[PDB]
Design a protein around this ligand. Structure first.
Ligand SMILES: O=C1CN(S(=O)(=O)c2ccc3cc(Cl)ccc3c2)CCN1CC1(CO)CCN(c2ccncc2)CC1
Ligand SMILES: [Ca+2]
Lengths: 235, 51
């Protein structure tokens, strides 16, 4: 994350982090229920074996509310394409239930039609993670959350250097030095509405980090809803 | 009608059942008696920031 504030005690309780053998964070996730985590499908390649850590805000000073779960089965979207990041979405199944507590709670899933009319036409959205603080910096020990405003879909398309498929959407800034970055992929993109946040997107990709005239491309959760449902029954 | 005025006065999902509007909520919730609000049926409801 570049810019943004710091996730304060209880602010980003739906964040989840996928760690590797070395116990290093390398991608985000979003707790949907006690058994399922929502994440970007490309992240399912940066590790021979990983685990999803939840309830952790500062990697180093044991807050106590942490907790590590081993994935039971991983459900990657059939139509993923490393060549274009289309259908960049997956859903992990934990072997043991996530126990909800402070800095640990599941984020809501909206209704397709409703979310596109009221949740995305909103002025901004939340995106968080443990990713780099500068385009070419290190990861991050403190969990961060940035308020990325919604981007016009056409400026979106024109600014890119790559296709923006049906399952994608822009968010962030043209000039302001604020945007997700390496290690934030899979991370949650939530929208707040009346003190309630809905999972309106999966951190997918970007051309650099906070580069002028370039935006941050997320996965369009609303476009995948039925899939997430059909996946939380495992498939 | 019109879930456009102000989300139809719902705390969450809104629909325009033919004539007027109907409210509903996410899982783990329950529509209050006023058919407009949303009430948590548990201690750690989705969307809410732990506190
Ligand atoms: O793979 C990467 C990852 N980094 S990154 O780790 O700092 C990175 C990762 C995820 C991000 C998500 C948001 Cl919302 C914002 C910024 C981001 C930056 C940037 C460059 N690239 C290279 C690419 C080019 O910039 C990433 C996207 N791509 C295509 C191709 C065809 N169709 C769509 C996308 C090809 C390689
Ligand atoms: Ca810790």
């Amino acid at each position: 994350i570049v810019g943004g504030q710091e996730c304060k005690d209880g602010e980003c309780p739906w964040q989840a982090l996928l760690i590797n053998e070395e116990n290093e964070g390398f991608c985000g996730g979003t707790i949907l229920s006690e058994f399922y985590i929502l994440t970007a499908a490309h992240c399912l390649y940066q590790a021979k074996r990983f685990k999803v850590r939840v309830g952790d805000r500062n990697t180093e000073q044991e807050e106590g509310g942490e907790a590590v779960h081993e994935v039971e089965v991983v459900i990657k979207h059939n139509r993923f394409t490393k060549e274009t990041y289309d259908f960049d979405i997956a859903v992990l199944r934990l072997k043991t239930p996530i126990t909800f507590r402070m800095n640990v709670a599941p984020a809501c899933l909206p209704e397709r039609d409703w979310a596109e009319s009221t949740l995305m036409t909103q002025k901004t959205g939340i995106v968080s993670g443990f990713g780099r603080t500068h385009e070419k910096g290190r990861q991050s020990t403190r969990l961060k959350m940035l308020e990325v405003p919604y981007v016009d879909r056409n400026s979106c398309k024109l600014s890119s250097s790559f296709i923006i498929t049906q399952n994608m959407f822009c968010a962030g800034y043209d000039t302001k030095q604020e945007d997700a970055c390496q290690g934030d992929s899979g991370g949650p993109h939530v929208t707040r509405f009346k003190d309630t946040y809905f999972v309106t997107g999966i951190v997918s990709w970007g051309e650099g980090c906070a580069r002028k005239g370039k935006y941050g491309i997320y996965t369009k959760v609303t476009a995948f809803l039925k899939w997430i449902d059909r996946s939380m029954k495992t498939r | 009608k019109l879930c456009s005025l102000d989300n139809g006065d719902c705390d969450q999902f809104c629909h325009e059942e033919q004539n007027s509007v109907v409210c509903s909520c996410a899982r783990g919730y329950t529509l209050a008696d006023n058919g407009k609000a949303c009430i948590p049926t548990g201690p750690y409801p989705c969307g809410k920031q732990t506190l």
